[PDB]
């Protein structure tokens, strides 16, 4: 269904967001 | 309205991820990581 | 250029938060 | 330190990012 597909898309995009935030955190610690 | 509201949230999440991608690329360049 | 690059990273994070705030706003309205 | 101030700012904004992402997740599950 449409609502389920969109709910799944939200979770897919949030998983990518958490990774990207984790990468910013990782790299921020290295900036010197 | 819930389909419209979820579609709009997806659009905002796409924009949010775009900006985080940009922050990652920027810091990679700063620290010299591929 | 270190400071300019961090300043730019900060601007990107401000924009990322702006868009997540908007998503939170749309979904509160939905619920 | 300019650099330290900006690194701390990155961390501050990432902490807010994580909360906002958790809220989208919480609310998406109620809408859906
Ligand atoms: Na934007």
UniProtKB/Swiss-Prot annotation, chain B:
It is found in: Nucleus. Residues 6-27 are annotated as: Leucine-zipper. Induction: Translation is induced by amino acid or purine starvation, or during growth in low or poor carbon sources. Translational repression during nutrient-rich conditions is dependent on four uORFs (upstream open reading frames) present in the 5'-UTR of the mRNA; these promote ribosome dissociation. Translational induction occurs in conditions reducing translation machinery efficiency, leading to ribosomes scanning over the uORFs, and increased translation of the mRNA. The rapid translational induction is followed by transcriptional induction at later time-points, independently of the uORF sequences. Phosphorylated by the cyclin-CDK PCL5-PHO85. Disruption phenotype: Abolishes recruitment of the mediator complex to the upstream activating sequence (UAS) of amino-acid starvation responsive genes. Decreases RNA level of genes involved in amino acid biosynthesis and cofactor biosynthesis during amino acid starvation or methyl methanesulfonate stress. Growth dependent on amino acid supplementation. Sensitive to amino acid starvation. Sensitive to purine starvation. Decreases cellular glycogen levels during glucose starvation. Master transcriptional regulator that mediates the response to amino acid starvation. Binds variations of the DNA sequence 5'-ATGA[CG]TCAT-3' in canonical nucleosome-depleted 5'-positioned promoters, and also within coding sequences and 3' non-coding regions. During nutrient starvation (low or poor amino acid, carbon or purine sources), it activates genes required for amino acid biosynthesis and transport, autophagy, cofactor biosynthesis and transport, mitochondrial transport, and additional downstream transcription factors. Belongs to the bZIP family. GCN4 subfamily. Residues 89 to 100 and 106 to 125 define the N-terminal activation domain (NTAD) and the central acidic activation domain (CAAD) respectively, which can function independently to promote high-level transcription of the target genes. Homodimer. Each subunit binds overlapping and non-identical half-sites that flank the central CG base-pair in the pseudo-palindromic motif 5'-ATGA[CG]TCAT-3'. Interacts with the mediator tail; the interaction with GAL11/MED15 is direct. Interacts with the SAGA histone acetyltransferase complex. Interacts with the SWI/SNF chromatin remodeling complex. This is General control transcription factor GCN4.
């Amino acid at each position: 269904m449409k609502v389920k597909q969109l709910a799944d898309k939200v979770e897919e995009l949030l998983s990518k967001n958490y990774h990207l935030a984790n990468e910013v955190a990782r790299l921020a610690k290295l900036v010197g | 309205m819930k389909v419209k509201q979820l579609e709009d949230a997806v659009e905002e999440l796409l924009s949010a991820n775009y900006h985080l991608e940009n922050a990652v690329a920027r810091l990679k360049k700063l620290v010299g990581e591929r």
